[PDB]
Amino acid sequence: LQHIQRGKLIQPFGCLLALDEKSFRVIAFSENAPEMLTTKLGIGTNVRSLFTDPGATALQKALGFADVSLLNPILVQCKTSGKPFYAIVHRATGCLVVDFEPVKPTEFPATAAGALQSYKLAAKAISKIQSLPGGSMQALCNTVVKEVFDLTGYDRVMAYKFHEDEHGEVFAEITKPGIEPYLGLHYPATDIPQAARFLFMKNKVRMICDCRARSVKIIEDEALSIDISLCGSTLRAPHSCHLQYMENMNSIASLVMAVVVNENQKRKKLWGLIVCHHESPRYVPFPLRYACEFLAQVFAVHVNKEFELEKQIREKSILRMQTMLSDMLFKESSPLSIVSGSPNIMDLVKCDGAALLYGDKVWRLQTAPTESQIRDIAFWLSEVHGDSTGLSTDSLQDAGYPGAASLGDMICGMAVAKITSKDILFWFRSHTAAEIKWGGAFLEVVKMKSLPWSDYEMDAIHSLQLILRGTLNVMDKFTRVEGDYRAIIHNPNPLIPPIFGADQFGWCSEWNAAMTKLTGWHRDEVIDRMLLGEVFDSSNASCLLKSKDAFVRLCIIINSALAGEEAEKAPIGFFDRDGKYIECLLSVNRKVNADGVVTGVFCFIHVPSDDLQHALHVQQASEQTALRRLKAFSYMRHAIDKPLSGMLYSRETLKGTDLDEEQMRQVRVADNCHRQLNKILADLDQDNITDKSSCLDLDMAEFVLQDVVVSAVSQVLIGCQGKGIRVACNLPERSMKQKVYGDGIRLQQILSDFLFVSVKFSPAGGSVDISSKLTKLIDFELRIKHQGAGVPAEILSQMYGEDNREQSEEGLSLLVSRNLLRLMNGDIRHLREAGMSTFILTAELAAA
Amino acid sequence: QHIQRGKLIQPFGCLLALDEKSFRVIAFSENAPEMLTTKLGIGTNVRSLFTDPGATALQKALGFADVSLLNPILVQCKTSGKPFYAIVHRATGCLVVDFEPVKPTEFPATAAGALQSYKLAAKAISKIQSLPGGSMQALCNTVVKEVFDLTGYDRVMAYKFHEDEHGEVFAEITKPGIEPYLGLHYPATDIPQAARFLFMKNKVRMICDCRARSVKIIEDEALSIDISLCGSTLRAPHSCHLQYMENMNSIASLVMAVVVNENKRKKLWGLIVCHHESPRYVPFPLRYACEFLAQVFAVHVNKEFELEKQIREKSILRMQTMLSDMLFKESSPLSIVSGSPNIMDLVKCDGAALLYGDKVWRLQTAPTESQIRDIAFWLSEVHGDSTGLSTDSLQDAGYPGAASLGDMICGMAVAKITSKDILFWFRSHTAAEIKWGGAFLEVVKMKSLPWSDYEMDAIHSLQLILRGTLNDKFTRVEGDYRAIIHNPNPLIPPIFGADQFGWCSEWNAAMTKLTGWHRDEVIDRMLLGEVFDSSNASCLLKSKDAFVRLCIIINSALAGEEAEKAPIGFFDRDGKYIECLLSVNRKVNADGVVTGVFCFIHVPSDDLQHALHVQQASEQTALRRLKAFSYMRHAIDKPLSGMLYSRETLKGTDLDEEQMRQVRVADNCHRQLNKILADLDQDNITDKSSCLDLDMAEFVLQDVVVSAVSQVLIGCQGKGIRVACNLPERSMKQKVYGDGIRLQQILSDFLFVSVKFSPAGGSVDISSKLTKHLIDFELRIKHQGAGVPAEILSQMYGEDNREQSEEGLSLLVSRNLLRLMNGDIRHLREAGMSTFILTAELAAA
Ligand SMILES: *[C@@H](C)[C@H]1/C(=C/c2[nH]c(/C=C3N=C(/C=C4\NC(=O)C(C=C)=C4C)C(C)=C\3CCC(=O)O)c(CCC(=O)O)c2C)NC(=O)[C@@H]1C
Ligand SMILES: *[C@H](C)[C@H]1/C(=C/c2[nH]c(/C=C3N=C(/C=C4\NC(=O)C(C=C)=C4C)C(C)=C\3CCC(=O)O)c(CCC(=O)O)c2C)NC(=O)[C@@H]1C
């Protein structure tokens, strides 16, 4: 690191000057600076003398105030020859470094700069980043790398990712055709030393022009007791080993940006780097570098948003299983009833199988070891781990179980639970497959390791332990993570939601430990009292409410629950024994008897976090009842189904009777278009509505393309007859009859959409010609040619931008056609020649 | 005064007094010994009077510190087991027990608690909780109707107290033959303040009969402390109350107070007064149920109070936005007369005028030019010191004239921007009249709506803006003729702006007040980095993410797209966090070159901010759902054209006659499908009115019924349901005139809903009858098993069933269509089967 700070070298693509703040006089200068700055500069020269007034005034004004990086690009004209330069000044402890870069004359009209030009060029890459739905890191990385690729034009663009063990993994990348990819690789922690990361925290952009270019030394004043550090400057020479490492990667001009993410003024850590590479020397102007840095910043912001979304998603699962536990405690849960009923031991935690040993009998679910070896497992647990109870591990071999060959490769992670000495519970998980490529290229495989058991997932099992043991009614139990061969002791705190109840006459009858903690009132001080008036009241009670309106609402809720209709999550709030306001969500379940007489209520409370209490819990209630559409044509979706069934039955009866080839082909065409109709309405499910591009799967089937083409013609031939146009399909017979494997319905929809567009846009007397090409995997090419004015420019531009909400019906439809086409690695090519319009469709199919 | 001194009770129940500690009787009613024993002198204990259970319960209830929680205590007397409700009150250091007879009508009352009283009145609460808010009259009507249904009294009203304590009958429900009293105002002296205090103490007052003589209570000679039975429900009526009761032609009554929080402090909104022509009795559980209903109504009043505040705040925000827009483009005094933001929308009025450059411009209803000159002269002469004035009235305002001029104008607001030029706002009078039952009337035709303080605040702001853009002393009398008050505010939003290079170039005074900085300390500095920066600046932001978002907002605004109401937050000079909304508008010169931005900041209250956030988050889901559904609606079209083509070919091709009917059924089904898609006509009106444009043409009913059957034959086969159609061939095939396409849907959706709930192995029987030219068509569809659930059956019986389920909606629409052509639907359930009877009127061919 000290060599980097104390080194005096620069790249030959610019010049460097050192000025004194109090005197504005040159102290040190680049060796090549006099040669193309005066095409004589010396120590103590005044920078005003050697630069023209329009630029010298700007430079002198910029040198004044401290925070000088606000207007960094200063276009400056040399007095001697009038060559344009970019002046970029960096503050330092008495150094005041200045960098001059040569402007590219090809964009000389770009005079007049500032931090506001060509960041309107990064506006597209920002406005299309914002439009992505969240929850998908891979999509965000793909979009970011693709936009950096498009903006900069470098060969390779990557998204280098740092893991918890500071080892790099290429998360996403894009590259020019004809270049070897590097996606999926993994790199050790020694590639990027801590000095590089410490520098990238400070200098967020690093750029190198040529790897083989010779560095230029810098001379300095002999009276300088303090060396001029070039750490701030962007003209610093490459370091003695970075050069060799990038030489081994066959790269020359790399451009590296750092992504800074809060560690979770918060502490901030590097999520990774954006690294652009090239094979030949390359140069980039300053505004593009600034725009890319700003793009990295907004990428980091969206990464933070993804972290918050993941935290909320993880938080909701606490409430879900708390509700499950409350439901399991509401009814008397026997060890027999738990295994059979719907809230079984297969949904308490995400597990691959479950088992139960009690009453000297064994029950299993899904995948579990047989009756023989499960008793040996119980015996081993009893002998080795006698005093401590509760075990969790992801590998029986790591613990040291002797007999595991009989179990097999599957069923590797084991979690146990002990209600008492004999009766015990089992959860069984299967080990996953891990595969990482190092390429320092060798393959590394790790087997027989299952997913780790989170302390949350053991707290759930502990709560189930307590519930079952209390219902059946061993002491001071302690469980182990078994992360390594050494055994460490848990401190598992249970979580059971606060629960209280009242009988049919309104007297309080239940007050458990969680409520005792929440309110502070011990059970003995609240029981045998009126629930509404003596315990919960706004005037004189143990837990005062906010106001009389809240008490009235609570009475309404309790009485309505006693009447038959049960609440699910009603927000309430009250003051505890210490006077602190508590806000929570209360739910009441009616309690009935065998004879059908209501005995009372059974209320339980879970308190979510403030962020979760607001978002999606108060803001959202069926989108806060966005019932605007719920009447308009929502009834149509239901009402159109029955006539569809009517004509399916009609077509079945039609095909039941004896018909020759001519009618059979038409019946097949009908059935094909009806299947297309059912398929398109199949996508109308809310699962594909919440996220439009969520499900992108296809139906594999064997089909003949001739039927697809015939139906495509027939779906628009009515309009063709209406406008009196002729459609000709010049397709070879032998190639058209060969079966293919794929989804002909989606290609059918796409073609038919293109034919509809062409027929609508072509006036009367026109012609449509469809030609087919089969290349041998089968490459299918379809050319549709028509005459007329062609597709209007506005619709073409609309259909070339998916994010455009101005999407006309034709434009939206064509965008969906391309989105479907991209699934099988297809592309649409539009050509306009002599006024004729040609559409080229490419597809890949599996030969039968 | 003597609200507690009177030792008289209405003889419909007994009363006893009990010592605080000894639990012994001191005083008893004169009729108590006869109704409780047949000695009842100074008895030793009340436990020996009643049987064990009741006596034990009464002793326990007397034991508790709080007694109001166990008011209904059913007790029995050992003499003959007469059931008595025993209500216990605890006041003035003594207990008072009231025993009301339990009528043998409802001998198994089984209430005995404050829980069955609620369940007596659950449906009314459910009705009130479903009403959309914002309308007080609908809530009053619903509450009074539910109370009328519950109690069963002849006459009921809601009695509303105004600010001057004069009471108005806001609503009323009466049985036929009773003179209505709606809207008749009453003097404020009808209700003395003692009654209001009692109603704030006791929420129920009930009188069985106003003519029956009262009886007294025998007090203990030894005791020297009065019972003071003020809190008991057996208190006798007051004499003047009796006179006003007989004045109102009511003989029995029961009233309940409505207490709402006043803006914790609470006040009496009014009463819910029930009246009868003959003496009536109501048992205690019904009284408690109605009191709880009154409490629910009082709860629901407060949110209607809050909605008005939210509306007012939104209006203030909108006018601030209008003021900012007016400042955005330099507005000359001559630009507001004809431009889009004219002086009409600033404050509600009926006309406007302007006098600039000795030229007069008028808008909407306003006096003539000479009258404008005379008003200007009188304003200059009489009030020369004032520069802003507003009179609700002009005849008595001190202006000689405007009497024979007329013009139907009373209110006038005038603002003086400069020495000799003024704006105008003319307001026409509203016909106001009140009617006093005790009838007479008071009519005022010379007073308009008053000038609100905020409506003058707007005028002051507009005057300031115009004076500033044309370019001290601030006096503004807003009293008509007698009063004089002054000191209005600007309420101009905080405004700032940045040059095209990012340099700050404008800092409003309101912004100075909001942030604490000064214009000279912030001008000519970079807006992003030196003024609004996350690390070292004048007004620090929360974090780097907020700074990046603000940079994105400003740069996007400079690019030609404007942001409105984007939430931001920052620390002021004193370290106080401020959360507000920012809106940026691009500023473009007349040559087509932009020259910076122009930002202004709203500061809504927390509740309004929460509501705005909720609505802004909610609208997006509806937008995307609409977009997706429109795509789906368009994309349906393509394959139906192909199916129609193919069916046309099949019909064209030579085919036997037996499939002619099959192809016809298909085509009928397809055109029926086309019908609903063609029903994009403004959310079809349906109901009885609906669209009377039903297809009028000849057809065959048998084909329609066959198509309807085939529409559900697939589901019938799936579930293995056997369908029998016993239709007479001669009658079923007879030609008729009318609509058959809609009838197909009417029979098909009913068949589908019958099939859906059909148990496995069930059977469906369909019969058709023709009555005789006009033919009455009767279709009976019978299926076994339970049948349609009661919820869907009710939701088909009527249309007011909250949100409507898909099958329920379909059946509703079917009922509307049936009612269109004089048809009706009847459902019968007898011994585990459901049958639907469908009646239609058709014209025979
Ligand atoms: C004589 C001194 C004045 C007087 C005295 C008085 N009034 C009350 C109580 C009530 N007055 C009521 C008035 C109305 N009832 C109606 O039918 C309507 C309107 C539709 C009116 C104006 C009512 C009702 C009450 C409240 C009690 C109730 O029974 O509901 C009292 C107190 C009596 C008591 O002992 O509680 C007194 C002393 N009222 C008058 O109007 C005359 C001029
Ligand atoms: C020298 C013996 C070791 C070494 C030293 C070293 N490396 C850097 C900096 C970088 N190395 C990078 C590596 C990668 N980028 C990629 O695209 C890939 C793979 C596809 C990898 C692994 C990156 C990134 C940098 C930064 C480049 C930049 O321009 O800053 C440094 C710091 C140099 C400096 O600028 O101070 C040093 C000392 N790297 C090695 O792996 C060898 C063994």
Side-chain angles (χ1 to χ4, degrees), chain A residues 4 156 158 160 170 182 187 190-193 196 199-200 206-208 236 239 241-242 245-246 249 254 256 273 275 277:
Chain A
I4 289 172
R156 252 189 271 135
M158 320 209 298
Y160 204 90
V170 184
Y182 278 142
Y187 291 90
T190 89
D191 287 338
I192 312 105
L199 288 173
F200 283 165
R206 182 64 197 269
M207 172 191 144
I208 177 175
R236 222 181 329 118
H239 150 285
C241 203
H242 161 189
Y245 191 63
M246 261 174 22
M249 316 212 261
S254 59
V256 173
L273 325 176
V275 192
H277 275 192

Side-chain angles (χ1 to χ4, degrees), chain A residues 624-670:
Chain A
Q624 212 37 59
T625 73
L627 84 83
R628 177 181 295 104
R629 154 90 161 170
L630 261 77
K631 56 209 95 65
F633 259 23
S634 151
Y635 148 72
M636 162 265 267
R637 168 83 202 79
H638 174 183
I640 60 156
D641 292 320
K642 319 162 297 178
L644 293 165
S645 78
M647 339 169 264
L648 315 149
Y649 158 79
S650 313
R651 201 186 279 101
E652 184 37 61
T653 48
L654 194 32
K655 88 185 321 170
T657 80
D658 289 345
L659 313 174
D660 67 77
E661 300 177 348
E662 184 66 36
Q663 309 115 330
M664 193 97 66
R665 170 197 163 167
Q666 304 251 20
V667 169
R668 204 92 49 93
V669 153

Side-chain angles (χ1 to χ4, degrees), chain B residues 80-355:
Chain B
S80 169
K82 295 142 161 293
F84 281 173
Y85 282 137
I87 298 139
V88 187
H89 313 276
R90 185 212 224 284
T92 73
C94 69
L95 298 166
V96 279
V97 278
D98 320 330
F99 305 118
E100 319 191 334
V102 182
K103 296 315 312 193
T105 67
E106 191 180 323
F107 50 109
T110 68
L115 263 278
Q116 302 54 30
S117 312
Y118 168 96
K119 85 200 194 155
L120 260 165
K123 61 174 307 308
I125 283 172
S126 84
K127 259 309 291 294
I128 305 182
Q129 287 214 303
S130 69
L131 267 162
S135 36
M136 188 136 292
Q137 191 73 35
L139 187 66
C140 291
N141 293 348
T142 297
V143 164
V144 80
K145 193 204 307 312
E146 306 312 8
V147 157
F148 167 78
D149 264 9
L150 257 293
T151 40
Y153 274 108
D154 284 333
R155 186 195 322 229
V156 294
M157 42 202 87
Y159 189 92
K160 177 180 178 185
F161 285 99
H162 281 286
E163 276 301 323
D164 44 327
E165 271 71 24
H166 90 289
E168 168 195 358
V169 178
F170 210 67
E172 153 196 326
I173 276 299
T174 53
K175 276 182 179 174
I178 295 333
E179 42 267 38
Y181 284 161
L182 207 155
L184 305 182
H185 294 245
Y186 278 80
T189 189
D190 279 340
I191 287 286
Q193 283 81 21
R196 305 178 197 224
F197 163 55
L198 259 67
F199 289 137
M200 276 190 108
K201 187 178 180 181
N202 299 118
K203 284 211 42 150
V204 164
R205 259 297 268 164
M206 201 215 88
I207 298 181
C208 273
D209 191 358
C210 58
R211 66 171 76 123
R213 65 160 326 155
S214 173
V215 317
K216 60 154 75 63
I217 58 200
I218 289 283
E219 204 156 355
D220 192 14
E221 283 83 8
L223 188 68
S224 58
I225 294 102
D226 198 2
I227 288 98
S228 88
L229 58 64
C230 185
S232 180
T233 182
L234 261 70
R235 178 161 28 93
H238 173 296
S239 50
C240 190
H241 181 314
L242 273 194
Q243 317 310 308
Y244 216 82
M245 181 86 157
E246 69 93 28
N247 161 73
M248 271 285 328
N249 242 348
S250 61
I251 218 78
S253 69
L254 154 67
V255 313
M256 317 145 176
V258 180
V259 166
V260 305
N261 62 275
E262 61 103 19
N263 40 0
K264 208 154 178 177
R265 288 303 314 281
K266 298 178 177 296
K267 76 174 178 70
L268 205 67
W269 178 96
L271 320 180
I272 299 173
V273 180
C274 316
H275 281 152
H276 210 263
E277 298 296 333
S278 78
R280 203 175 171 80
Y281 179 88
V282 181
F284 188 93
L286 208 39
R287 286 203 280 278
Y288 198 94
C290 292
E291 168 190 332
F292 190 70
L293 196 56
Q295 269 179 17
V296 168
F297 166 53
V299 156
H300 265 230
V301 160
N302 298 336
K303 33 190 64 178
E304 322 279 340
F305 279 179
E306 299 307 313
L307 254 55
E308 285 165 23
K309 283 187 53 186
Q310 271 210 353
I311 280 182
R312 187 186 317 155
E313 217 62 35
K314 277 193 225 187
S315 175
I316 296 186
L317 286 202
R318 165 182 318 141
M319 146 192 307
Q320 266 184 347
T321 285
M322 193 178 296
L323 275 185
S324 157
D325 172 32
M326 204 168 298
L327 251 176
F328 168 54
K329 47 199 82 169
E330 273 96 330
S331 187
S332 70
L334 312 179
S335 48
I336 47 185
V337 279
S338 56
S340 170
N342 43 356
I343 59 188
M344 220 76 58
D345 313 308
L346 189 74
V347 51
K348 273 186 62 43
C349 71
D350 273 30
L354 212 168
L355 166 60

